[PDB]
Amino acid sequence: ETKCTLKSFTVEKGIYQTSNFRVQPTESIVRFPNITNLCPFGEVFNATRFASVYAWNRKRISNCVADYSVLYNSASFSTFKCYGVSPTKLNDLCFTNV
Amino acid sequence: NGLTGTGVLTESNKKFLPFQQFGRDIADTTDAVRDPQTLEILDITPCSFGGVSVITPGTNTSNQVAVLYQDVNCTWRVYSTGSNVFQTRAGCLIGAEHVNNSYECDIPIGAGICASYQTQSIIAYTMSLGAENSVAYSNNSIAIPTNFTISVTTEILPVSMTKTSVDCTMY
Amino acid sequence: IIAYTMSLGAENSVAYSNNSIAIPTNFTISVTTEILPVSMTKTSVDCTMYICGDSTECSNLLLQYGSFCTQLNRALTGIAVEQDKNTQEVFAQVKQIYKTPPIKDFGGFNFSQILPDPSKPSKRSFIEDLLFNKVTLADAGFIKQYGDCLGDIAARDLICAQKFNGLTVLPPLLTDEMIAQYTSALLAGTITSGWTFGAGAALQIPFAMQMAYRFNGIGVTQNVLYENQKLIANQFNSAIGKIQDSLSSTALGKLQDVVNQNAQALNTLVKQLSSNFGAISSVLNDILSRLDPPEAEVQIDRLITGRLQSLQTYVTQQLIRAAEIRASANLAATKMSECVLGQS
Amino acid sequence: SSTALGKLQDVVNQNAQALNTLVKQLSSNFGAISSVLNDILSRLDPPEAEVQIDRLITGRLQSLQTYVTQQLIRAAEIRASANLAATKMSECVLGQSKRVDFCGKGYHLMSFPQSAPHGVVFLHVTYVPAQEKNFTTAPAICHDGKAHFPREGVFVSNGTHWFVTQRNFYEPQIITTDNTFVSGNCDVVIGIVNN
Amino acid sequence: SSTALGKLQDVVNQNAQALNTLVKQLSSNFGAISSVLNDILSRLDPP
Numbered sequence: 001e002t003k004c005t006l007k008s009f010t011v012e013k014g015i016y017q018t019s020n021f022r023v024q025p026t027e028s029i030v031r032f033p034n035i036t037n038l039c040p041f042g043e044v045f046n047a048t049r050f051a052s053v054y055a056w057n058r059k060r061i062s063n064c065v066a067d068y069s070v071l072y073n074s075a076s077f078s079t080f081k082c083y084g085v086s087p088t089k090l091n092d093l094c095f096t097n098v
Numbered sequence: 099n100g101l102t103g104t105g106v107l108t109e110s111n112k113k114f115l116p117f118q119q120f121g122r123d124i125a126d127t128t129d130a131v132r133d134p135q136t137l138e139i140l141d142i143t144p145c146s147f148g149g150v151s152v153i154t155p156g157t158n159t160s161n162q163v164a165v166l167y168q169d170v171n172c173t174w175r176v177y178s179t180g181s182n183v184f185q186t187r188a189g190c191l192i193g194a195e196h197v198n199n200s201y202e203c204d205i206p207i208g209a210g211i212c213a214s215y216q217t218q219s220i221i222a223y224t225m226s227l228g229a230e231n232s233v234a235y236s237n238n239s240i241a242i243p244t245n246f247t248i249s250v251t252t253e254i255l256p257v258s259m260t261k262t263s264v265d266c267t268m269y
Numbered sequence: 270i271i272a273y274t275m276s277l278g279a280e281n282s283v284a285y286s287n288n289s290i291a292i293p294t295n296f297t298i299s300v301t302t303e304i305l306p307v308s309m310t311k312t313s314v315d316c317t318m319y320i321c322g323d324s325t326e327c328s329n330l331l332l333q334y335g336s337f338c339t340q341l342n343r344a345l346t347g348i349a350v351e352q353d354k355n356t357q358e359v360f361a362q363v364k365q366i367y368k369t370p371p372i373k374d375f376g377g378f379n380f381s382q383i384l385p386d387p388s389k390p391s392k393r394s395f396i397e398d399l400l401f402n403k404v405t406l407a408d409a410g411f412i413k414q415y416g417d418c419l420g421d422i423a424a425r426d427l428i429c430a431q432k433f434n435g436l437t438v439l440p441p442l443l444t445d446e447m448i449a450q451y452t453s454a455l456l457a458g459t460i461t462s463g464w465t466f467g468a469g470a471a472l473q474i475p476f477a478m479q480m481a482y483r484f485n486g487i488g489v490t491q492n493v494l495y496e497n498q499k500l501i502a503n504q505f506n507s508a509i510g511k512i513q514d515s516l517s518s519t520a521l522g523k524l525q526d527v528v529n530q531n532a533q534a535l536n537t538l539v540k541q542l543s544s545n546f547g548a549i550s551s552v553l554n555d556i557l558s559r560l561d562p563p564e565a566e567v568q569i570d571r572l573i574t575g576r577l578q579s580l581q582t583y584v585t586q587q588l589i590r591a592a593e594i595r596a597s598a599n600l601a602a603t604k605m606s607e608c609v610l611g612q613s
Numbered sequence: 614s615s616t617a618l619g620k621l622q623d624v625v626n627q628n629a630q631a632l633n634t635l636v637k638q639l640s641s642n643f644g645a646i647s648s649v650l651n652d653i654l655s656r657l658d659p660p661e662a663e664v665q666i667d668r669l670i671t672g673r674l675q676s677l678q679t680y681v682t683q684q685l686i687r688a689a690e691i692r693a694s695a696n697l698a699a700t701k702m703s704e705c706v707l708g709q710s711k712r713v714d715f716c717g718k719g720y721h722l723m724s725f726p727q728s729a730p731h732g733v734v735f736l737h738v739t740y741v742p743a744q745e746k747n748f749t750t751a752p753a754i755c756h757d758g759k760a761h762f763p764r765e766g767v768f769v770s771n772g773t774h775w776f777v778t779q780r781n782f783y784e785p786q787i788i789t790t791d792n793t794f795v796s797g798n799c800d801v802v803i804g805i806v807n808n
Numbered sequence: 809s810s811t812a813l814g815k816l817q818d819v820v821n822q823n824a825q826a827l828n829t830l831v832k833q834l835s836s837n838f839g840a841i842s843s844v845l846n847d848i849l850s851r852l853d854p855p
C-alpha cells in the first residue's frame with residue numbers, strides 16, 4: 001500500500017499512514033413490504049374509454065406489485081420516457097404517491 | 099424499500115412518527131430505517147473505522163514491517179495477529195518486540211514510544227529524555243572553573259528558494 | 270445600552286526642572302505570568318473515506334484525482350512533524366535531567382508551589398495542576414474503539430462522527446509527563462546553578478549569592494540584597510501565593526482558542542457533507558439508486574469536485590495557522606533561552 | 614568533508630517536487646472523456662467539445678492555483694528564516710552578543726560567515742568553562758565590626774585561608790581594601806564570616 | 809518635505825487592487841452562456 005501510494009518500489013525508513021481499516025460486506029439483503037396483488041395494468045392501459053384532454057382523468061394506485069413485464073405481449077408503446085429516474089432501475093425501486 | 103447501502107444494522111431506540119420511514123443525521127446520510135415488514139426501527143452504522151500506520155526500517159535493509167492499529171485495544175479488527183502484540187496509548191502495535199531499555203528516539207510511534215531495527219528484528223521502547231544528574235547544592239559551597247575550552251560550532255540557515263514563472267496558456 | 274468615547278488612560282504630568290531628580294527609596298519584587306502556545310492538534314485525512322465512503326463506483330471515479338489526495342496528505346504530515354519539532358525546541362533545551370536536593374535551604378525563598386509534587390500520579394507542580402484544569406481538550410485519550418460508538422452513539426458524539434468520515438487525530442510524541450520532567454529539570458538547574466547550566470556544566474552556588482549577582486546585573490549593589498534578604502524573600506513568597514490564588518480563582522484564553530479553532534475546523538468539514546454542489550442530492554446512495562452508471566456519473570462528478578475543494582480549503586487554512594503557531598513557538602524558545610537560562 | 618546540510622537540501626527538494634507534481638497532474642480527466650486536447654478536438658465538433666475542454670480548463674486552473682498558494686506559504690517561511698539570518702549577521706558577526714544561546718552554546722566570543730547554496734553557515738566561536746573545583750564561600754567578611762563585600766568577585770576558601778576571585782576563572786587573590794568595599798556592620802548579613 | 813513612504817503606500821495599493829480585481833472578476837462567464845444573471849433568467853426557464 002505504501003509502495004503504491006509513494007509511486008516507488010523502494011521505501012525509506014520511517015512510519016507511514018495507510019488507509020483506514022476496511023471491512024467487506026458478507027451478505028446482501030432486501031426488505032420490501034408485504035404486497036401480493038398486481039397493479040391494475042389492464043384497467044389503465046386496456047380501458048375501453050379514455051377521457052378528453054381538457055378533462056383528463058387522474059387515478060390513484062396503491063398496494064400492488066408493479067411488474068410491468070406483463071405488458072410485453074399485449075401492448076406496444078410508441079413513446080415511453082421517464083424523468084428523475086432510470087428505466088433500468090424501475091424494477092428495484094419502491095414508489096410513493098403513485 | 100429501494101434505498102441501497104452498506105453497513106451494520108442494530109436494534110434502535112428512536113421512535114418514528116407514523117408518517118416517517120427514514121432517519122437522517124447532520125451530514126444527511128440515512129442512519130435509521132423502519133423495517134417495512136416488522137415495523138421495527140433499526141440503526142445503520144458504517145463498517146470501516148480506525149487508522150492504520152506501517153513502520154518500516156527501509157526496504158533497502160529488510161521487508162520486515164510492524165503495523166500500528168491506532169484504534170484497537172487488546173488485553174480484533176486487525177489484518178493479522180502474528181506474535182509480539184504490544185499495547186500502547188497510541189494503539190496496538192503488531193510485529194515489534196517490547197524491551198525494557200530506553201534509547202534516543204529512532205522512529206517515533208507516539209505517546210512516548212519509539213521503535214528501531216535492533217537485535218535482527220524490530221523493537222519498541224519508551225524514549226529516554228536524557229542522563230540523570232544531581233547538583234551538590236549546599237548553603238556555603240561554590241564551584242569555580244579552573245580551565246576553559248574554545249568551541250566552534252556551525253549553524254545553517256536557508257536564505258532563498260528558487261524563483262519560478264508559469265505561462266498559463268502553455269500549461 | 271450606552272455609547273461613549275473610549276479613554277486612553279489617566280492623565281499625568283512629570284515635575285521636570287533643570288536641577289531636580291527623583292530617586293527610589295524602596296522596591297517591590299513582582300511576579301507576572303506570560304502564556305504562549307507551542308503546538309496544535311495533529312490531524313490526518315483519508316480522502317477516499319471522506320469523499321466516497323464505502324461506494325465502489327465513487328472510488329473508481331476518484332482515481333482521476335489521486336495526485337490531489339497525495340498532495341493533501343503530504344501537507345498535513347508536514348504540519349504534523351513540525352508540531353513535534355516545535356515542542357522539542359521549546360522544552361528540550363538541556364539534556365541533563367537535574368534533580369533538586371532535599372536541602373530546601375534557599376535563603377528563605379519558598380519554591381514549593383512550582384516544584385514537582387511526588388504525591389501525584391504524575392509529578393506535576395501545584396501551579397501546573399491548576400493550569401491543567403483550565404483548558405478543556407476534546408480528546409481524553411486517543412483510543413476510541415469501534416464497539417464503543419456502535420449504534421446511535423455515532424452522530425451524537427462528534428468524535429465518532431469525525432472518525433466515520435476519515436478524520437483522525439494523532440497523539441503527540443512527548444507525553445505530558447515527559448514535558449513536566451523537562452520543566453522540572455529546568456527549574457532544578459536554574460535554582461541550584463544560576464545561569465551556568467545553560468553555558469556548560471552546572472556549577473552550584475548558594476541561592477542568596479546568585480540573587481546578589483542578579484541584583485548586580487540591574488545596577489544595584491549586593492549589600493542592598495544582603496541587608497534586605499528577609500523582606501525580599503517575603504515579597505517573593507507573597508507574589509507566588511498571589512499567582513496561585515488568582516489562577517485557582519478565575520484565564521488561559523490564548524491556549525483554549527487553539528483547541529477551539531481546530532475542533533471547529535473539523536466539525537465544519539463534517540457538516541459540509543450536506544451540500545449538493547449543484548447535484549440532485551448530497552447522498553451517493555440516492556444517486557446510485559434511481560440512476561444508472563453513465564448518467565449518475567455526472568452527479569457523482571459534481572459531488573467529488575465539491576468535496577475535494579472542501580478538503581483543499583481545510584488544508585490551506587491549516588497551513589496558515591501552523592505558520593502562526595510556528596512563530597509563537599520560536600518566540601517561546603527564545604524566551605526560554607534568554608529569560609530562564611540567563612538574565613535579559 | 615567526512616559526513617550534512619539537510620535544511621538546505623530540503624528547499625531544493627521541495628521546489629523540484631512541486632514542479633514535477635504540476636507536470637504529472639496533466640494526466641487527470643477532471644471528469645472529461647480524456648485528458649488530451651487532441652483526442653477531444655478530433656472525434657468531437659466545437660459546441661460539444663467545448664464542454665470537455667471547459668472541464669479540463671477548470672481542473673488545470675485549480676492545479677495552478679494550488680501551486681501558487683503553497684508557494685506563497687513556503688515563501689513566508691523562507692522570509693522568516695532570512696530575517697533571522699540577517700539579525701544573526703548583524704548581532705553575532707558585526708558585534709558580540711550577550712543573548713544566551715543566540716550565537717552558539719557557551720559565552721559568545723565571535724562568529725564567521727560562510728556562504729552555502731541558497732543559505733548561510735555561521736561558525737560561532739564560544740568560551741566554555743572546564744575543570745571546576747569545589748570551594749567554601751561566604752557572602753561577606755567581618756573585620757572591624759564592619760562588613761566587606763567583594764567589588765567584582767566572590768569570596769572563596771581553600772579550606773584554611775580566604776581569597777577573593779573572579780566568578781568565571783579561578784584566580785585567587787588576597788583580600789585587601791582595594792578588592793572590597795564596606796557597608797554597614799556585622800549584624801545583618803546572614804552567613805558573614807570573620808577574617 | 810522635499811522628496812518617501814513606499815512601504816506604507818504599498819499596503820494601501822495592494823488592498824485597493826485586490827478589491828478592484830474582485831469587482832472586475834464579475835465579467836467572467838466561467839463556462840456559462842453569459843455573465844449576467846438577468847440575461848440568463850430572461851430567455852431561459854428555471855430548470
Ligand SMILES: *[C@@H]1O[C@H](CO)[C@@H](O[C@@H]2O[C@H](CO)[C@@H](O)[C@H](O)[C@H]2NC(C)=O)[C@H](O)[C@H]1NC(C)=O
Pocket residue numbers: 034135
Ligand atoms: C408479513 O408477512 C409475514 C409472514 O410472511 C407476517 O409475519 C407474521 O407475523 C405474526 C405476528 O403477528 C407472527 O405470529 C407470524 O408467525 C408471522 N409469520 C411468519 C411467516 O413469520 C407479517 O405479520 C406480515 N405483515 C403484517 C403487517 O401483518
Ligand SMILES: *[C@@H]1O[C@H](CO)[C@@H](O[C@@H]2O[C@H](CO)[C@@H](O)[C@H](O)[C@H]2NC(C)=O)[C@H](O)[C@H]1NC(C)=O
Pocket residue numbers: 244245246
Ligand atoms: C587546560 O587544558 C589544556 C587542554 O585543553 C591542558 O593542556 C594539555 O595538557 C596536556 C598534558 O600536559 C597535553 O597532553 C596537551 O597537549 C595539552 N593541550 C594543548 C591543546 O596544548 C592544560 O594543561 C590545562 N591547564 C591546566 C592548568 O590544567
Ligand SMILES: *[C@@H]1O[C@H](CO)[C@@H](O[C@@H]2O[C@H](CO)[C@@H](O)[C@H](O)[C@H]2NC(C)=O)[C@H](O)[C@H]1NC(C)=O
Pocket residue numbers: 282283284285291
Ligand atoms: C516633587 O516635587 C514636585 C514639585 O512640587 C511635586 O509636584 C507637583 O505636585 C503638585 C501637587 O501634587 C501638582 O499640582 C503639580 O502639578 C506638581 N508639579 C509641579 C509643581 O511642577 C512632587 O509631588 C514631588 N515628588 C515627590 C515624589 O515628592
Ligand SMILES: *[C@@H]1O[C@H](CO)[C@@H](O[C@@H]2O[C@H](CO)[C@@H](O)[C@H](O)[C@H]2NC(C)=O)[C@H](O)[C@H]1NC(C)=O
Pocket residue numbers: 294295296500503504
Ligand atoms: C519598604 O516596603 C515594605 C513593604 O513592601 C515595608 O515593610 C512593611 O512595613 C509595614 C509597616 O512597618 C508592615 O506592616 C509590613 O508588614 C511590611 N511588609 C513586609 C512585606 O514585611 C518597609 O518598611 C519599607 N521600607 C522602608 C525603608 O520604607
Ligand SMILES: *[C@@H]1O[C@H](CO)[C@@H](O[C@@H]2O[C@H](CO)[C@@H](O)[C@H](O)[C@H]2NC(C)=O)[C@H](O)[C@H]1NC(C)=O
Pocket residue numbers: 771772773774
Ligand atoms: C591555602 O592556601 C595557602 C596559600 O596562601 C596555603 O598556605 C601556604 O602554603 C604554602 C605551601 O604549603 C606555605 O609555604 C605557606 O607558609 C602557607 N601560608 C601562607 C600564609 O602562605 C594553605 O596551605 C592552603 N590550604 C589548603 C588546605 O590547601
Ligand SMILES: *[C@@H]1O[C@H](CO)[C@@H](O)[C@H](O)[C@H]1NC(C)=O
Pocket residue numbers: 041042043046074
Ligand atoms: C387487454 O386485451 C387483450 C386483448 O383482449 C388481452 O390480450 C389482454 O390480456 C387484456 N389486458 C388485460 C389487463 O386484461
Ligand SMILES: *[C@@H]1O[C@H](CO)[C@@H](O)[C@H](O)[C@H]1NC(C)=O
Pocket residue numbers: 158
Ligand atoms: C539502496 O539501494 C541503492 C540501489 O540498489 C543503492 O545505491 C543505495 O546505496 C542503497 N542504500 C544504501 C544505504 O546502501
Ligand SMILES: *[C@@H]1O[C@H](CO)[C@@H](O)[C@H](O)[C@H]1NC(C)=O
Pocket residue numbers: 171172173185186187188410412
Ligand atoms: C485498554 O483497555 C484497558 C482496560 O480495558 C484500559 O485501561 C486502557 O486505557 C486501554 N488502552 C489504552 C492505552 O487506553
Ligand SMILES: *[C@@H]1O[C@H](CO)[C@@H](O)[C@H](O)[C@H]1NC(C)=O
Pocket residue numbers: 197198
Ligand atoms: C521488563 O520490565 C518488566 C516490567 O514489569 C519486568 O517484569 C521484566 O522482568 C523486565 N524484563 C523483561 C520482561 O524483558
Ligand SMILES: *[C@@H]1O[C@H](CO)[C@@H](O)[C@H](O)[C@H]1NC(C)=O
Pocket residue numbers: 379381382
Ligand atoms: C512554603 O509555603 C507553603 C504554603 O504554600 C507551606 O506549606 C510550607 O511550609 C512553606 N515552606 C516552608 C519551609 O516554610
Ligand SMILES: *[C@@H]1O[C@H](CO)[C@@H](O)[C@H](O)[C@H]1NC(C)=O
Pocket residue numbers: 234241745746747
Ligand atoms: C563537590 O563536592 C561534592 C560533595 O561531596 C561532590 O559530590 C562533588 O564531586 C564535588 N565536585 C567537584 C567538582 O569536585
Ligand SMILES: *[C@@H]1O[C@H](CO)[C@@H](O)[C@H](O)[C@H]1NC(C)=O
Pocket residue numbers: 237238374803804805
Ligand atoms: C547553613 O545551613 C546550616 C545547616 O547545616 C546552618 O547551620 C547555617 O546557619 C546556615 N547558614 C546560612 C548562611 O544560611
Ligand SMILES: *[C@@H]1O[C@H](CO)[C@@H](O)[C@H](O)[C@H]1NC(C)=O
Pocket residue numbers: 755807
Ligand atoms: C567574629 O568576631 C567577633 C568579634 O571578634 C565575635 O564576637 C564573633 O563571635 C565572631 N564570630 C564567630 C563565628 O566566631
